[PDB]
Design a protein around this ligand. Structure first.
Ligand code: ZN
Ligand code: ZN
Length: 291
């Protein structure tokens, strides 16, 4: 039976894929096989997606949009989650520390095309700090705690559990949750390569359907923690904190939410974003039953 390979990073934004996998194991005869392929950074994951070594992936929405603007055959079918993003600073730092008086502040981000960059820029404006006084440095999420503890950066923005890990692993302080900066900003989405939708629609629909059911199971916090402790190289305390600030449920990619990201990408001249109908294929998730 048809194997679907889906790529991910071990962050809460991809945890609904783990739940989907667990649910699929409960059928006597599942309609497809789900292979979850792990990556440590975003560029490696996108290369596997673009070369077809994986059939889909949970990925940064801006990164996927840029790839789409560059001719990618992918389509976003659902959100991976709601919230679950943080902005970390060095130990004992206060938001009032930031000013226009001295040297520039250095922030780690997972990729230049990320909601993390947008969150930080919005926080910069809310703090009335001049443009260019925050400098951004791309790095893998797992590398951020060490970069922070060893003062190569002032702070960072990333999906949990990499903020909670910063607090545990040495010295990091949670300055802000994404929620406090841009309420319900979309971050990661489940994207599928176009051929799955065109050529294996029954399998694609079955997969999104299991994914949809899983999304609602994940509202129960005990479950989201249990799913993650199983799959991720993190302790239960780090993952309880991580799960507490992430939500799932209705994972529809809504036009309004998508439009917010396009506005922000356009506003920072990142790239010209693709229209909703060219990037998003919301039929699979809408037709899938909640039950
Ligand atoms: Zn991330
Ligand atoms: Zn994300």
């Amino acid at each position: 039976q048809q194997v679907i390979k889906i790529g991910y990073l071990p962050i809460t934004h991809s945890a609904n894929l783990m739940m989907t996998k667990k649910l699929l194991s409960q059928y006597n005869h599942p309609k497809y096989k789900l292979e979850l392929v792990k990556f440590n950074n975003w560029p490696d994951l996108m290369d596997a997606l673009n070369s077809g070594r994986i059939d889909g992936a949970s990925t940064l929405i801006e990164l996927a949009m840029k790839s789409k603007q560059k001719g990618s055959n992918i389509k976003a079918v659902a959100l991976g989650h709601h919230e679950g993003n943080v902005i970390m600073g060095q130990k004992g730092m206060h938001l009032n520390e930031f000013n226009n008086n001295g040297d520039d502040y250095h922030f780690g981000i997972p990729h230049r095309y990320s909601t993390h960059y947008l969150l930080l820029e919005e926080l910069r404006k809310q703090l009335k700090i001049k443009p260019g006084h925050f400098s951004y440095h791309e790095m893998s999420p797992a590398e951020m705690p060490a970069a922070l503890s060893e003062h190569r950066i002032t702070g960072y923005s990333v999906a949990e559990p990499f903020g909670a890990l910063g607090e545990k692993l040495g010295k990091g302080k949670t300055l802000k949750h994404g929620d406090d900066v841009i309420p319900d900003a979309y971050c990661c989405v489940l994207v599928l390569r176009g051929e799955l939708l065109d050529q294996h629609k029954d399998v694609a629909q079955a997969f999104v359907q299991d994914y949809k059911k899983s999304g609602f199971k994940m509202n129960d916090r005990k479950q989201s923690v249990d799913i993650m402790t199983h799959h991720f190289k993190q302790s239960r305390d780090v993952l309880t904190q991580s799960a507490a600030w992430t939500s799932y449920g209705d994972l529809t990619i809504k036009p309004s939410g998508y439009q917010e990201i396009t506005t922000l990408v356009k506003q920072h001249h990142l790239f010209n974003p693709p229209a909703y109908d060219d990037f998003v294929e919301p039929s699979l998730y809408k037709e899938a039953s909640r039950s």
